Design a protein around this ligand. Sequence first.
Ligand SMILES: Nc1ccn([C@H]2C[C@H](OP(=O)(O)OC[C@H]3O[C@@H](n4cnc5c(N)ncnc54)C[C@@H]3O)[C@@H](CO)O2)c(=O)n1
Length: 124
Amino acid sequence: KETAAAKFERQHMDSSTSAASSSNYCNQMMKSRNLTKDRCKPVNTFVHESLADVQAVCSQKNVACKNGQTNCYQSYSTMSITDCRETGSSKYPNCAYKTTQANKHIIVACEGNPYVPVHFDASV
Ligand SMILES: Nc1ccn([C@H]2C[C@H](OP(=O)(O)OC[C@H]3O[C@@H](n4cnc5c(N)ncnc54)C[C@@H]3O)[C@@H](CO)O2)c(=O)n1
């Protein structure tokens, strides 16, 4: 089945755009990337950087993840991200999100060999 590394690219990477261009970005991306297939995922962040720059975070500042694991890493630099959060009108299968564009450091969890991101922990 889909690997954790591939799932991270499908749910969190958007190298094709530098930022969200309209308030409908989240609604369109959450549906196209199949994140709303089974239910409305409540929160999801998309990163507008090259995949190589995001994979490189696995060799940057080590930090504990929110849940305590120690395989988390914080990017040294800020990155262009789009934060998607479910709105009060969201109702499966018509999942609805608020689009927020920002520049923040990202924290991801890394695993395997090659050592790559497999989970998005937070934006700070
Ligand atoms: N600002 C935010 C806040 C939350 N989120 C998303 C990221 C998460 O999904 P995902 O990246 O698939 O991660 C979940 C998967 O990762 C796995 N996982 C969790 N911690 C891990 C760790 N330390 N090492 C490896 N895998 C881990 C469990 C599961 O399969 C989800 C809940 O944390 O919400 C976000 O996009 N932006």
